[PDB]
Design a binder for this molecule. Structure first.
Ligand code: EMC
Ligand code: EMC
Length: 152
């Protein structure tokens, strides 16, 4: 893996641009907010991009037509936190960790959830944490990564 310094918000916007047409076609209300425009991390940009694409794809599928997605990025002491929320039904308590298993596959609309690989990227490769919670009439997926491999 290749760690480089990059603006995390720039990467989030790059991923939004990938989905902009689909989001609009589906009439989804999307918003992105940050608490620090110059939020920079040292991480593997390609791999973090893969996690973002996977979470946004899942948010769109989950929220469906006329849905809502909100992304936030937050600058924490030795880490950053990215939260991707969608309006939709809550994840049942028994499935919260099972969705991250390489052998969760009770999921279609044509595609697997990809979350075991997201976990590998966030937790194994970057020493962070990724989890889900139910909130505000929807579901959030949150990841945190150390700002540098040295703050792991
Ligand atoms: C109402 C979706 Hg930022
Ligand atoms: C499908 C890579 Hg999180």
């Amino acid at each position: 893996m290749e760690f480089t310094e990059f603006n995390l918000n720039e990467l989030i916007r790059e991923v939004y641009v990938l989905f902009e047409e689909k989001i609009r076609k589906m009439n989804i209300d999307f918003c992105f907010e940050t608490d620090n425009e110059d939020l920079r991390v040292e991480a593997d940009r390609t791999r973090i991009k893969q996690v973002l694409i996977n979470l946004v794809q899942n948010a769109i599928e989950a929220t469906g037509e006329n849905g809502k997605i909100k992304i936030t990025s937050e600058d924490m002491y030795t880490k950053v936190r990215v939260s991707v929320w969608n309006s939709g039904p809550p994840i049942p308590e028994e499935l919260k960790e099972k969705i991250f298993s390489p052998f969760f596959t009770t999921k279609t609309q044509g595609t697997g959830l990809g979350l075991s690989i997201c976990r590998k990227i966030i937790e194994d490769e970057h020493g962070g944490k990724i989890w889900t919670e139910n909130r505000e009439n929807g579901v959030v997926f949150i990841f945190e990564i150390p700002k540098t491999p040295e703050k792991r």
